[PDB]
């Protein structure tokens, strides 16, 4: 079950210098970087597309604002059961042992995005890496 999955490293990661920490945890679980982009400021269209599912929620504009308030890294990762596993890795701000669990404490500012399903992954990879 070899998969690719899309990871965004969010502006708060850069603010708090947790970028390598975050990538290191994914690296140590043996997943490989397939492609990678650094955006000093992400084009607002990309961000809007990326969180399209949310275009209606009341947190949509604040979220876009924040996602654009600093650098982000978009990463395509590959490995056995990648989508599911990098999601567990991402975790949530409640449970320790995870990226969010250990280093994040905000509903908006939570360091990392990881695709949550087979479809969202294909989608998200084409948004950030259109060249396939």
């Amino acid at each position: 079950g070899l998969q690719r999955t899309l990871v965004l490293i969010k502006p708060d990661a850069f603010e708090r210098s947790l970028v390598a920490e975050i990538m290191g945890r994914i690296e140590k679980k043996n997943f490989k970087i397939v492609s990678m982009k650094f955006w000093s400021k992400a084009p607002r269209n990309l961000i809007e597309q990326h969180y399209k599912e949310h275009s209606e929620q009341s947190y949509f504009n604040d979220l876009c604002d924040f996602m654009v308030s600093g650098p982000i890294i978009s990463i395509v990762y590959e490995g056995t059961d990648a989508i599911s596993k990098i999601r567990r890795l991402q975790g949530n701000i409640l449970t320790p042992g995870t990226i969010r669990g250990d280093l994040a404490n905000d509903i908006r500012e939570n360091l990392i995005h990881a695709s949550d399903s087979e479809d969202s992954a294909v989608d998200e990879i084409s948004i950030w890496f259109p060249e396939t």
Copy 2:
């Protein structure tokens, strides 16, 4: 925004794990608001801090240990600080938490964190009357 009371226990000093513990709370973006180093804490304060436990078998050993070496009392502050730092503290069974990664005993478990809004307000008062 919330505040909570953390105690670094004597085993933490014994085992040179003080920075490791504080570091974990630091990495989850919680901020120190007050801090005191007690080379040895007054048994009075301990018994207050653990007053709800005054009727248990373990009560006297607890206090004995709690005055067996230094402790640091810290007031932390951040969003949802009380329950998040509590989840961080964890227990000796759950790896990923402080106790889960570093502690192996029912008594010597490195850290105390307030477990409710009331406990916090009261414990803070105990350790930081001012």
Copy 3:
């Protein structure tokens, strides 16, 4: 109180240089080394005994071939509730916070073995450390 349990650092830990990482996690939880042996190559029958409850499975041969594909270390750890506590520490590749949860991503190449009960502990210790 005190128990002793048997741990194996598997060949993948050597290949991936996670020997110290694994051992460090058991060390930071306050467990002590009572015995320890480094095997550049473990004799096959030791492996086969160690996994004897597993001899009828389909995976049995490949497992043994893997366990013989590089160095292993056998360690007897001692501590309160050591068997159960070191088992949780090992965890599984689905559980962030544990050894396999953070560092392994494979059904067979999962870094570490830990005894799962009092009897298997006593049995496994006598296999790697028969001189007692």
Copy 4:
């Protein structure tokens, strides 16, 4: 044998969340905390006394303003050869392996202060811990 020395964790360590990192390095070299105080804001005259040998320099005012720009922690560490050993640990922004060498990149915002002699140690301790 035993010496005590005075350490300050400067405001930049709080802003950058390196308080535990700094203290950990001193802890891993086996030095012990004898006294310790957290100041959300250090009174200015304490800072000025602490840096009194520095009062005629051009940088004197900005230094003091910085030291007052956030929390600091004053710590008395005790250990063999503590004054000299903790000084080397602090190092400088040019020397990899030390605190400033790995984590600081600035003439003024350099994370940590350590006493540089027996006399300054005795003097600085009496400033932050006059109750003795």
Copy 5:
């Protein structure tokens, strides 16, 4: 003295999963990523240009071969005294405290490249990031 400098993360870093470790050390010394590229396999022309100074040494072909035997990351870093400081950080396989000092042990396979001068930096940044 604000500077940009060019860093390459070499294939051995990917082999040994030290990528985030290496980047983390630069991050913790407070340098910022200005731009960044991931190359699954670097175009051999780029590598030849990058090590042009060496086109004559007997190690030139082996070096190119190795630089192309796996992924690399090219990074432009910014910060006070960046060229000089990231060079100290890089270090050499003899002295601990550095990236190479702590993690490398080969004259060829040494994890990281960092520009060593103001000119080599301008040059190397234009090779990998021609868009300026």
Copy 6:
């Protein structure tokens, strides 16, 4: 390619620093070739290992400590292993090395590494006659 002899000393076990030490040697890409755990080492072996020091004031305290707790003897292998692992060991003055980061005493200093090709061949023989 070279081989060298490393001893993890009892203070390393006392202070729970065994993985930290081995980990540093592991990260510089050196490989374990033989390893033995001694719960307590025969004073005989120690005195051999430290035979060149048999005439110093510190000699008996040295041996006393060296048999005061467990030790691990390791044979490492890698390019230029003897001098590189020696540089890694360092001394209590030089931060960045093992002793420089973790040790603060002239006797209890966590680790021994062979310091020459001859010392290595001889020390290896001592700890791994086989």
